[PDB]
């Protein structure tokens, strides 16, 4: 697994550990989506929400998928590609999650659902890319959704990942 895959895994671990020492709320106050327009120029917040996890099974399950799919994008399409997928999906899934239910949310599953959508579409339309998602997993992904949690994140991420894959799958 490449550098981008790894950097993100260490960022999420580092942040998780801080949340255990300082407590969730303390880290949330600084890394969450702006709760107050006054804070709108604290630019990190549109990304840093993705780095916070709230339970062990939350971090594990997300980093799992991220290691699997992230690594495959980074291996097959390079580090720049995965950066862009990450940044766009984090920001957009954040934007929509905030609208649904306000700013108190976190987790990499926005990014994860974008990656899920990207790998699957791109593998259907462009088998040349060398990436694909088994239909067994696209069914598990769809079960996660209907079981929903940042619902706005999941669905906004997915959208983003399909869009980018389509764009990339013509060229």
């Amino acid at each position: 697994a490449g550098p981008v895959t790894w950097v993100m895994m260490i960022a999420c671990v580092v942040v998780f550990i801080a949340m255990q020492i300082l407590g969730d709320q303390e880290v949330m106050l600084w890394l969450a989506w702006p709760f107050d327009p006054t804070l709108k120029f604290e630019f990190w917040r549109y990304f840093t929400h993705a780095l916070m996890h709230f339970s062990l099974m939350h971090i594990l399950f997300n980093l799992l998928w991220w290691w699997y799919l992230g690594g495959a994008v980074e291996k097959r399409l390079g580090s720049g590609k995965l950066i862009v997928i990450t940044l766009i999906s984090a920001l957009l899934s954040g934007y929509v999650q905030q609208k649904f239910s306000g700013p108190w949310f976190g987790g990499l599953s926005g990014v994860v659902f974008a990656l899920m959508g990207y790998v699957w579409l791109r593998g259907e339309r462009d088998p040349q890319s060398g990436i694909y998602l088994q239909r067994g997993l696209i069914i598990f992904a769809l079960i996660w959704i209907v079981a929903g949690m940042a619902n706005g994140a999941h669905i906004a991420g997915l959208a983003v990942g399909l869009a980018m894959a389509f764009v990339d799958s013509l060229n």
């Binding site: 929400h49 999650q97 599953s109 926005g110 940042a150």
Partner: peptide
Amino acid sequence: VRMA
């Protein structure tokens, strides 16, 4: 808090 919601999980994403």
